Structures are given as C-alpha cells and as structure tokens.
Model the fold of this input.
Amino acid sequence: SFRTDKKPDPANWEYKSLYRGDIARYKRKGDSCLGINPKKQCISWETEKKHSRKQVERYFTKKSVGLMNISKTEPEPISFIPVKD
Amino acid sequence: RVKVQSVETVEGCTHEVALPAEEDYLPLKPRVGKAAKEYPFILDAFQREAIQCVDNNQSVLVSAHTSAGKTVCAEYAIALALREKQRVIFTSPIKALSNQKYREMYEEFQDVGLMTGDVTINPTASCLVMTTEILRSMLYRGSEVMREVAWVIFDEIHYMRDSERGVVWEETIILLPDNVHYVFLSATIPNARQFAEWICHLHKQPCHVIYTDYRPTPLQHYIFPAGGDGLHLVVDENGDFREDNFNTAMQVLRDAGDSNVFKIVKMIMERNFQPVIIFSFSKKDCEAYALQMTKLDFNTDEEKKMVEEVFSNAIDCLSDEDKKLPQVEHVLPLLKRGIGIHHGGLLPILKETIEILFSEGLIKALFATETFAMGINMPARTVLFTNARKFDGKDFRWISSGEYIQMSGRAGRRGMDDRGIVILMVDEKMSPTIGKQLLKGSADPLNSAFHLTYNMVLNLLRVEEINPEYMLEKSFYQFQHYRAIPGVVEKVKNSEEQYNKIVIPNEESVVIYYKIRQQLAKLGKEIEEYIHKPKYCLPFLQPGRLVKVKNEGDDFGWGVVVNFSKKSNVKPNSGELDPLYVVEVLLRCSKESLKNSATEAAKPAKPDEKGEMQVVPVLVHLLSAISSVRLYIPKDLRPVDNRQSVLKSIQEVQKRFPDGIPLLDPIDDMGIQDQGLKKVIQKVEAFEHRMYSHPLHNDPNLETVYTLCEKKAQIAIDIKSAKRELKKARTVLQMDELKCRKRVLRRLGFATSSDVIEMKGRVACEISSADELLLTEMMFNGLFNDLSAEQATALLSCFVFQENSSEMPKLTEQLAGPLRQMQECAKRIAKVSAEAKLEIDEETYLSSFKPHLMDVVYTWATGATFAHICKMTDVFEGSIIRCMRRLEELLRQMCQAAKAIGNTELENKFAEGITKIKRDIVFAASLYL
Ligand SMILES: Nc1ncnc2c1ncn2[C@@H]1O[C@H](COP(=O)(O)OP(=O)(O)OP(=O)(O)O)[C@@H](O)[C@H]1O
Ligand SMILES: [Cl-]
Done:
C-alpha cells in the first residue's frame, strides 16, 4: 500500500500533462466533469443500445415462453404476496 | 375582498363556495325542469353537487382523483350551454389531451370542433374543444369564436403550476370576460379553495370548490424490497398505512429479515394482474427492461395476428421507405409478444399505435417513461415503479407525493377492476416518516408559475383596453403573495419566540467564540482555494496520491488520484476563454450513484453504506485536501475488486494515522509563494490563539452550548429573511421586471415611450413559440433576406431545439454562416438587457440556443429521407421529430410575422420552408382524429 512522497513533478505544470506517473486502465464515470457548475462549459473526452440495435434485434427472432392465458377475474388486500426466485 | 362559506354535503365530499364579499350567500337552488344531460350510470355525490352548481349558473372547480369522474360535470355544462343555444369551449393543455377530448366530446354532443395549431376542425362549432394555448391567441386576436360563449371548461387545470406553459392558463383566464362562467377540472389539490377565491376575486362572481377523495376503483399499494421474497402491503384499500409491513419490508433491506422487475412482471401475468404499466425514469431503462420481457411471450396467436393487423394498419399511411425503418421494424416483435414501450424519444406514429394497442388489450405490459402519466389517460390494472428514487439533475431524491400520486393514479380501471395494484420497488432504506409522506401524502398545491414574456407584454400593449400591468395585478401569482402574508407575519412571531425560548446560552460570550470558529472556517476555505489553483496542484497530481474531493455540499472524503488532463472549453455558446483542469479521482460513491451513467450523478456513500470506488473526473477546484500519502494502485482499475482494493488501502492509512492523514503544507511542501496566502495563514494562526484563550473551549458541555448558539443563529437568519419577505407585502412582485422589459422594448424600437405598439412590435406578436425579440430583430437586420431556404429553416432549429444532446456537428459554411451571425445579434440584445437592469448573463443567453441539430434539419429540408437523418445525430428519434414539429409551428409564427411587415418574399421563403420540412412520418397524425 502506502508511502509518503512529498516531491513535486514540475513537468505536469510545465508540459501541461502528466509526466512521472503510471496510469491505470479505468473506466470513468460518464462524459462530463463533476465540478463544471453552470454547464456554461463543456469538454470532450471524444455506442448506443436501442431497441432496433442489432444485438437487440436478434433476441426477438429467438423465441420465448408464454406463461398464462385465460383463472378468475382477480383476487383482497393481502399483506404479503410472494414471488418466487 | 372575498369570503368563503362552507356547505354541507354527504358522502365524504366537500362543498365550499367563495363569493364576493358584498353579496349574501344564498343556498343553491334545486333544479327547475329536467336535467340537461342524463347518464347511464348513477352519479356520484360529488358529481351531483357540481352539476347543481352548473344548473344554478355558478362556477365550480371540481377537484377529484384521476378517473373519479370529473369529466361528467363538464359534459353537463356543455349540455346546458347547448340547450340554451349559447356556445361553450372546452380546453385542454396538450394536443394529445385535446384530441382525446375532442373525440370524447364528439360522441355525446354532435356539434363539436377541434382547434389545435396543427388541426382545425369545425371552428364555428357549438362546442369547441381547443388547446388552451390556442385559446390565448384567440383572445389576443379578438376573435369571433368567443362571441357567443357562455361557458369555458378548463380540464386538468392543475398543470397550471408547470413552469413553462403555466402562465398561459393564467393569462387566458385573465383575458376572458366577467360574463363567462367556468367549470374547472383538476386533480386533488390542497389549495383548491385558494384558486376558487382568485376566480371570484377576478371575476366578481361565485366559484365553488367541490372536493372529494373518492376513488371509484380502490388501490392497494405495495412495496417490494430489493432482495426480498415478496411484496408487502404498505397502504390499504381504505387509504390506511400499515407500518408493520413497511417496517418489515424495510428490515429486509437491512438484510435483517431472516429484486428483478422481470420477476414482478412474471407474477403479474401469472396472478392475472395482467395489464401493467412499468415506470422507469430513464428512457434507456424503459427500453432495457422491455427486452428482458421478450423471453416470455404474453400473447395468444389470435392476439398476435391482432397486433399485426392494427399495427400494419396504422402504418399503411407511412411511406414504404419510412415503413422500412429500423425504428419501425424492431418494435413489432415486442408488440407481438405483448410488450410495449412508451417514452418521449420514440416516434409518434408508433407511440399512438401502442396506446391503441393497450386499450384493445393486446398489450399486457407497458414500460413507459415518466411522462406517460401526463398523457391521455389509459389506465392499467397494476402499476410498477422500478425505483422509488429519482435523479433531479443535481441531487438524488425520492419521488414526491405528487409524483407518486400521479403515477399510482394510473392504476385501477373503472369498469374493469375490483382493485388497483401499485408496486414500489425500493433499493434504499426508507424511513417511516419519509415513507408515510410518499404514499399517504398530499399532492402538490397548484401554485402559479406566471412569468413575464415579451409576447405577453407586446400583445397586451397592442390590445386596446388592457395593459401589461393589468395582467400582473390580476394574476394568481400576486394573489398568492397577498394571501400568504398573514403566514409570514405568523412565522416571524413564532420564530421570534423561539429565539427567546432558546435564548439561554449560559454565558453570552459564546457568540464571540462561535464567531471565532466561523471566521476560521471562512479562512480555511480561503487556504484551500490557493491549494487547488492549477499551478500549485498540478505538480502534485500523481497517481496514487490521496486527495479529498468536496463538491458544493456533497463531500466525498478521501480519494486517490488516477490521472489528470487539461481540457479545453467546447461550450461553444460563449467564447472558448479558459481551459479547464480535470482530475480523475477514485472516490467512494453510492450504490445509487453507480447506476447513473452521467458524470453529474456521482455522489458520496451514505453513512450506512459500504460505498464503491469509481473514478470520476472532477474539476480542479473541488479538491479540498491533498496529502503526503501516495499509495500503490493496481494497474487495471476496471474490476470492482481491483478498485475495491484502494478502499482497504485507504483505511490502512487511515488506521495508521488517526490524528488525520497528513497534508502537504502550502508553502513548505506546495511552495505557493503568493503573499496573500501568508496573510490568510497568519490570520488563521491568530484566531487559533484567540480560540484557545476562550474558556468555552476548555469547558465541558461546550458542544451542548455551541449547538444552541448555532440554533439560535439559524432562527435569526430566518427571522430576518421572513422580515424581508414581509417587506415586499404591499408590492407587486413582477412589476419591476416588466418595467425593465419595457425599457428594453423601447430601446430596441419595438414600442414607444407612451406605450403604443409600433410596427416592429407588431411583427413580434406573431412569434410566440420562441424568442421573439431576437427573431424580429434578426428579421429587421435582414439576416433572413439572404438566407438559403434550407438555411432559413435550419437556423430556426436553434430557436426551438431545446433538448440536451452531447454535441454539435461541424458545419459547412452555409449552415454556420448564420450561426455566426445570430450570435452577434443575440449578443447585442443581451447587451441591452443588462443595461436595462435585467438578470441574464451573456454567456448563458448566447448558449441558450442550440445548433446541435442544425445540420440535420437542413439535410431533412433538402429532400433527405427520415432514415438518413437519424444517422447523423445521437438524439433519439422522437426528440428529433419533436423539434421539427415545433419548427413548423415556428415557421407559421414566422410566416404570419412577415405578412405584418409586408415582405412577400419573406412570407414565401418561410412558407416554402415549411414544405421542404413538412413531410412523411414526421407529420402523420395517427392518433386517431
Ligand atoms: N357514476 C359513474 N358511473 C360509471 N362510470 C362513471 C361514472 N362517472 C364517471 N364514470 C366513468 O369515469 C371514467 C373517467 O371519467 P373522466 O375521464 O371524466 O375521468 P376524470 O379522471 O375525472 O377526468 P379527466 O379526463 O379530466 O382526467 C369515464 O370512463 C366515465 O365513463
Ligand atoms: Cl471499479
């Protein structure tokens, strides 16, 4: 784990970008920046999944089970209605 | 100048009448003659009372739940109006709402009309159904349609509190004459009497509020706790709250008991809860869920054919090229399998089709976005809420009582269900006090959202016997302020007593100590500000460094730096200006937080919670602390487990240094040499000396004493604040703003100093769908004269496109030439508004126009097919379509404006602009009409 390093790396400031660091592979949260306040600012770091998307579309060609059609009209206010896993 | 009388009624229904104070209250009179209208069913007590009000020629506001049967009152009034040969206009808020009412009214009464921006049918009908916004324009025109009208009906009047369109309801009411009588249909609101007093005050006649909590089909509400074996009945059929179930359901969340929506849906079909509406607050979530349901098929083959005949049948009008669209094609299998989706993003031809299908019974499950509740009411037997919590865009919150009330009011079908079932899926612990409010709480008060608009102002100047100022004075907004004054006074006194009751901090000198500590906090923030300046912090932004992130009240505690980048502003509403420094930091975020994709949604873990590490990029100024410690970081942070590892590491350092993990000194370590910080440091050092001198610090029970001082301080702020609110008691709140607008209008040349509308002003009246001030000014700068027809319409997309899309497409000069041109024009107006003392900021006005669909609209305009244009942008199809629909709307507003200033060329360029734009699926109308 931990260590204490009190030592500045001037490159980041001089060169405008990180120097002296090992960068991890990570997925960031979204596309914006937390601080940005009025959103009078926007930045670009620079893949949809909609219903008509191909991955989705082949799921419907593939069939599915039909559970219950037509017993009675309905059933009172029963305190616990279970539902199996 | 108004009094209220309460009148006795029977079956848990309330009747009160507000009358002008100088008139004696007289009991309503029993009907002479036969009823104007007769119904199939036996009327409810609330309906009868209201009906009697109409018989007696007095106005009534009926406030009852959705599906209670508010609509009959309106019908009876039309019947009465028609019977006496006078006219009636029934208005609805949305176009969708109006069409449904047009038809509904058409069946009962033969002579009916529909007036919408888009359609006009039977305009001189005895009963005319119109959108309220159209009605406002009619009042402005001074039209003949209002001439034989005796009654106006406002249905779903409780949408008046909506911010954008709320004002039009108020404005319409103000414009209408005293001679007219009204029937108000609304949902249950707490302040129903208040609204009725305003009508009486404004119209100098009685208005009755008839209120009932009756629900024809009762509901039983359930909460399913995630990871729970089953649903629990939190509220009964009788409207009672069962805490034991709530607590029991809640404990399961604690996991001390001893959550798919797929599962909930499966039981409903199994237990013949059958048609169900599933509510999700994300468009994407609604769709995601729907697919999941595709594994099971809920339809018989006879129904499967039925789905296809109607679907296909609706679709026949659509061009074959439009019919082959992916958006159209992929939907059909879902429908065939009994699944539907309904959200803002989807196409309108399909939207309506699903609504038709649901009504036929072909659709067993509907996963719809939150605005389905705000739609033509189609009820369902069961309602499922996928989440109890919502994202505001700023903070996470639970759904409000009004929010619950609307969505859960979609459950239960009058003819068809003995009970309605509402299900709440809940992922976070909920308190009993918090839970009780959600379910058994009241609806939102109909509070007005009147605001000043230039079109309102201009049009009022234009009209002869009214002024802009008159509208303000007679508004509901003003009425509420006046009426609420008694409370403000009461709050002050009560708050004042509170200060005295708690004015027993034992020695009065603690106020001085508190001020010392308060000063330290203020200074402490001043130190931090220097530490997160880019020059000083960039040097230390090394991976694995421990840093604290706090963002306007939600503070995340300790995080580790993962990476840093410098980014440039791509706003581009305003100028690029400065570049922003973003640091990507692994923070401990909420379970709720991780579920939201958006960057803005990140929030710190709750006290109960474990938390989860996410790397979220934050701006440089949000880091409140930087430390010496640097820690080892695994090199793939993608896995939860690997990211989780940092949390353990963070605690290992926390355990190791329990006096606080170490921070770098600004000068000793950061080296910031700014002289001003030293002063802050000195001043902080000084107060520390003062702080320790004080006796209080050392004294035991200091915390108890200080807390009173904080409490005492809070009341004073509230007392002062209330006193400020009281100071504005005798003043018209928005009048100052009107005058500021009026000054702007004069400077810009729209109107004269003596308030006579001028020719520039007259053109502007027509434009009510967008920023009229700019467009006429742009017209008067001749910007439109030299434009491409496609450019002319594409430029206007910015006037009416409001949705949030990630980014614009680079544009060929013909499209962006005007873009450059408008912004300067926009900038000029902005300069003058600020000059006139208004509140706006230049970056914001300039960036309030969105050019994101500029290309797309042009491309559509030139003859491109709809399918092609969808490729270009990431905003959904419905959103795209919506913007275009408003675009036609705007062009008509623009077309008319040109006639006023007599440019035939301009009329035609705009009028032929519509024709390029208005074609095929985008303009269909299948919602049967
Ligand atoms: N006494 C009654 N007996 C049977 N059905 C009734 C009765 N009163 C109303 N209804 C039915 O109630 C349903 C709902 O009425 P309506 O649509 O006017 O409801 P609402 O919620 O009050 O109004 P809105 O349309 O403004 O939301 C209608 O289908 C109507 O036929
Ligand atoms: Cl992670």
